[PDB]
Amino acid sequence: MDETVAEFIKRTILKIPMNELTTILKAWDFLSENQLQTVNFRQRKESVVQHLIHLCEEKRASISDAALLDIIYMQFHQHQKVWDVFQMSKGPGEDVDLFDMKQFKNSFKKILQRALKNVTVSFRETEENAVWIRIAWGTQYTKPNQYKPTYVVYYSQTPYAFTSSSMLRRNTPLLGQALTIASKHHQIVKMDLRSRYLDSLKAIVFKQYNQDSRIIHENIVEKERVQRITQETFGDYPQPQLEFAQYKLETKFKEPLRCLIKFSSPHLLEALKSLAPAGIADAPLSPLLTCIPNKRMNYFKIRDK
């Protein structure tokens, strides 16, 4: 029931598909169990997006949880708006003995509104211990832009804080800036993992992903070796990168030669695993691609050797 608040809620409601109305709307708690029966969810789209917005017209909806609704929308649609991964690093000393959720929500909002004074920062501490920040950016001259926010999934005590690579404005050095000040770290480093599958980034960065008698195949001793090296470089259940794993050359052709190799697959690490057995790749498939999760980063920055 406000400007760019009711309209923002309306714009983020029809985005979700017809199946997950109840699942998303139970989470943000504006609709108590009594209010869910008033709206009939099964008739049409424009009917539900009009009666649901009315239920917060009577609830006097505010941007603080209007952004939260977008947060739960993104938690079920994290496989869009390809995520950056930032990596914090404290110096020498003891750990952060006081990462209060209250203090972190305060120490992020304070530093973010210190310079970006017009923002609607809305945290939603998830049950997997991963603070799901969403920041609606906008300079002091303008209102906070909720059209394209920058969701930040800071895993609570982890150095790593995934960030939705939405625009990469002059705020992305301040997004890391307030992230490394709220969480008591010292340095922010984009580790150069840029994948659209957040549940796949979480596994890669935290290393939580693997924890006939007549037909005589003449090259059977070679196919077995191909399978062995494929099963020794891709052990089991390769995670889905689904990201443009860039490879920007600076290599002399055997002065230098530049190209920008971009692997584009719906499931990258399971496509490379099915390359050597398919004959597209050599059996010792190059570390160059196999150590994409083992390096926890797919936009590399090292040089020739």
């Binding site: 006939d212 007549r214 037909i215 005589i216 195949h217 003449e218 090259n219 001793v221 070679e222 196919k223 398919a278 004959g279």
Partner: protein, 168 residues
């Protein structure tokens, strides 16, 4: 280097040897080659490069079918890298050039003239097909068996040498 007559034949054994970089299509073609219950003991051999690591007791290869995937230039360049390991007595009757992927004609990294020039400069039959579809395998695999019974000498009127004089 493979030779056509280094090994004695079996008894009713007609052992083809499919040579192609992709082995999924080779395995499907071999499955289709034995789906029908023919009168010959077909011991189909698969491969990727004719160098064919030197293992004794290998039967007298009565046919080599260079499956050239027109979609991939690797399947060609490896074929010419496998044609330099063949006898001049092997290309007479006991050599066929399968050209899979052709007919789709939109994925062909190889022009179908280049494969016909390759199969005409070695004076051997070039049998076109599309190995990704079973409906064109089972009718082409039965062509590779009726060729195989010709080169293996199972039809007692037609030699391998007589074959390319019919497929010229």
């Amino acid at each position: 280097v493979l030779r056509p007559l280094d090994k004695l034949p079996g008894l009713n054994t007609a052992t083809i040897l499919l040579v192609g970089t992709e082995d999924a299509l080779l395995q499907q073609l071999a499955d289709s080659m034995l789906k029908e219950d023919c009168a010959s003991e077909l011991k189909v051999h698969l491969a990727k490069s004719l160098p064919l690591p030197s293992s004794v007791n290998r039967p007298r290869i009565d046919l080599i079918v260079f499956v050239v995937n027109l979609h991939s230039k690797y399947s060609l360049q490896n074929t010419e890298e496998s044609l330099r390991h063949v006898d001049a007595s092997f290309f007479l009757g006991k050599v066929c050039f399968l050209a899979t992927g052709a007919g789709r004609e939109s994925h062909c990294s190889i022009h179908r003239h280049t494969v016909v020039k390759l199969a005409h400069t070695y004076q051997s039959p070039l049998l076109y097909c599309d190995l990704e579809v079973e409906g064109f395998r089972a009718t082409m695999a039965q062509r590779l068996v009726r060729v195989l019974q010709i080169c293996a000498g199972h039809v007692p009127g037609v030699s391998a040498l007589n074959l390319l004089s019919l497929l010229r």
